[PDB]
């Protein structure tokens, strides 16, 4: 595995046939394995696209790897999903696992469906970043933090309080899977495409105010598109 060396203002592959001493490895603290947010590559953040990026496969056992400090994530995910028979789906995170240190909008999902596979797997092989351990598998509970890792040779309340958008799942692990945003014990908004967590946040203008606000024992499910809100379009 090659490492990028920072030298002469550029990255260079470490896997060369000469170890030129223009760079000195004075200590092990010049070593880096920093995580990077997958999102920083222009990768889509749609909740359905996230599903589209996971393999949903039974398979060779999961591994995680230790990695170095790195960038904040705007979007990450938490999962409660189970099989249609209520069986647990995806292993619970292993001891000492916690969600990534700085996702600003951790999305969360609940509900059930076939939830195919055992470890899911990232289709691009991108690592889930739980805390400081990169992963090949999706863990229940803790934040997914999709990302990639680079190895290189070196020469306030919102930091955890930020986090938005929780939703139900209808089915799981398939293209037919659907998700619905939930606020104020109301389930609405398929999250079909192009909706930032902030796009969804402004829709709390509807809570007990601009439309919505059922006068009945419970929620009616409006479709995301008043046109967006799909007020009174629940069925």
């Amino acid at each position: 595995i090659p490492l990028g060396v920072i030298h002469n203002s550029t990255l260079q592959v470490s896997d060369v046939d000469k170890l030129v001493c223009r760079d000195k490895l004075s200590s092990t603290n010049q070593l880096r394995s920093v995580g990077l947010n997958l999102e920083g590559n222009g990768v889509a953040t749609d909740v359905p696209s996230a599903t589209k990026r996971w393999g949903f496969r039974s398979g060779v056992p999961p591994k995680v790897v230790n990695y170095e400090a790195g960038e904040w994530a705007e979007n990450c995910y938490n999962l409660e999903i189970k099989k249609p028979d209520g069986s647990e789906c995806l292993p619970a995170a292993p001891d000492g696992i916690r969600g990534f240190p700085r996702c600003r909008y951790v999305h969360k999902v609940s509900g059930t469906g076939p939830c195919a596979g055992d470890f899911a797997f990232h289709k691009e092989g991108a690592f889930f970043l739980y805390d400081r351990l990169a992963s090949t598998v999706i863990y229940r509970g803790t934040t997914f933090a999709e990302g990639v890792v680079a190895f290189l040779i070196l020469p306030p309340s919102s930091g955890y309080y930020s986090t938005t958008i929780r939703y139900q799942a209808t089915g799981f692990g398939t293209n037919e899977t659907e998700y619905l945003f939930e606020v104020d014990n109301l389930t609405y908004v398929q999250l079909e495409s192009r909706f930032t967590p902030q796009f969804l946040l402004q829709l709390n203008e509807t809570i007990y105010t601009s439309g919505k606000r059922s006068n009945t024992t419970g929620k009616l499910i409006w479709k995301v598109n008043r046109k967006i809100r799909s007020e009174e379009l629940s069925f």
Partner: antibody
Amino acid sequence: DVKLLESGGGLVQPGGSLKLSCAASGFSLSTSGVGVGWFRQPSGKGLEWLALIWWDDDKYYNPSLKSQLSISKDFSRNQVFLKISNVDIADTATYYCARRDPFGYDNAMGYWGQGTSVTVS
Amino acid sequence: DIVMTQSPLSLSTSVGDRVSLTCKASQNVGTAVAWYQQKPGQSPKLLIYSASNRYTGVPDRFTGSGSGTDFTLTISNMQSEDLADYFCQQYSSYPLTFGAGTKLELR
């Protein structure tokens, strides 16, 4: 048009326990927001509420019976279940599994199962 | 929990009679109410939706009305086939409640 079906435990001693169930043979129940529930009519009595179940994983109970009542489901088979602790003769009744009929505005649930009944001895 | 009542508890009937039934709630239902029809050996079929619309497949003799705590069910041009137990329910809040019931007695 859904073939909602009824099933349940047989005759029980009073102070016993009973499990009841239903199923939607005519419908997957996979639409988000499906609501189903139960009510009973002892002795030709009006529609006493028993419980509500949502496909969105929401559960509700008639609080007077809630202390002895629990909701369970098996969606893979389109099944709904109720369990009742300490069943006794006061719980004998006509019962129905139910589903939203207009399905999505003002509840209206509305749609009925085949009907079942409970007795004790 | 919320009180529901209905009246008349029984009504004598004959063909062509305009049946009038009402449902009252302690709490302001706001039109989230429904009416039901029942006969022995049968489920209590839905009659009224959102305090006014007859349920589809309900005969057009049936009508309904009101808002707030007051609602009605009526039958224009009643037919003897319309004798039934009648009920209503509150969907504006829960635990769910239902009317005390009414019956019709043709004679």
